């Protein structure tokens, strides 16, 4: 494992981790996706030519910051389109290892062991459909990336808030890691009134 390889596996992950959730919750009509084989289970990806264009930047950029190890998190926020209030929040605490730059030694962990972990993480992601409340209102989503404060803000990008959910429940699921990056999830959802 290298510092660039990890920066590819994890960056690639979110691409599938995001697509799936968008379907899991129904941010976009199922009739707008297209199943494709990956990892060890069948995943669903988008087919919209704008949604794909957006996710490309966020993941391409996420990847780039994965190499500099300046990335701390990635959050998928789901909010009411009219009101603007958040109802569901997905956070992935990204943990990097800056020493990976100072190696000489490709790291011992096998890529199969890594892929098996990644498979599990996705498992919960979809295994969390009969827990996670249903969105009885028109919602959208945004991608929030927590970074170091001295990091240079790329073109077309800008700082934002945490997009809190006022009264919510944080429910941890599982996680995984390569050698240089340890990603751990959980999903927070608005508390039923």
């Amino acid at each position: 494992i290298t510092l660039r390889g990890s920066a590819e596996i994890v960056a690639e992950f979110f691409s599938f981790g995001i697509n799936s959730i968008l379907y899991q919750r129904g941010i976009y009509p199922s009739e707008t996706f297209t199943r494709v084989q990956k990892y060890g289970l069948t995943l669903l990806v988008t087919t919209d030519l704008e949604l794909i264009k957006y996710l490309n930047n966020v993941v391409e950029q996420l990847k780039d910051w994965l190499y500099k190890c300046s990335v701390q998190k990635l959050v998928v926020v789901i909010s009411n389109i009219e009101s603007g209030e958040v109802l569901e929040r997905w956070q992935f605490d990204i943990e990097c290892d800056k020493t990976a730059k100072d190696d000489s030694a490709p790291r011992e962990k096998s890529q199969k062991a890594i892929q098996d972990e990644i498979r599990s993480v996705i498992a919960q992601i979809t295994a969390t459909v009969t827990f996670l409340p249903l969105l009885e209102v028109s919602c959208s989503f945004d991608l929030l990336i927590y970074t170091d404060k001295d990091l240079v803000v790329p073109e077309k990008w800008e700082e934002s808030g945490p997009q809190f959910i006022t009264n919510s429940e944080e429910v941890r699921l599982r996680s995984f890691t390569t050698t240089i990056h340890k990603v751990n999830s959980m999903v927070a959802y608005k508390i039923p009134v």
């Binding site: 945004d142 970074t147 934002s160 808030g161 809190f164």
Partner: protein, 93 residues
């Protein structure tokens, strides 16, 4: 001052009471530490962070951003068309 501490027995009672008070103050502080602890970590998971350490970035142009624009527009188009159609109908007395 302390030379007057020839009153060992009376002094011990005072030191005793001081021990008790210092014990109370200690426990109250320990729990306050808990509250601070619980709150801090129970919020860090909800998305909280350190301004001096963490910064939140995103795409100025994004799904939510766009969806917010074609809500705005629609309610503008709708308002307009009602006026437009209204006009046409008014034309024809």
């Amino acid at each position: 001052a302390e030379q007057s501490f020839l009153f060992s027995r009376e002094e011990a009672d005072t030191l005793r009471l001081k021990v008790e008070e210092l014990e109370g103050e200690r426990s109250r502080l320990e729990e306050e530490k808990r509250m601070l602890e619980a709150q801090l970590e129970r919020r860090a998971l909800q998305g909280d962070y350190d301004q001096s350490r963490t910064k939140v970035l995103h795409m100025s142009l994004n799904p939510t951003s766009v969806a917010r624009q074609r809500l705005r527009e629609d309610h503008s188009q709708l308002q307009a068309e009602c006026e437009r159609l209204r006009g046409l109908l008014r034309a024809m007395e």
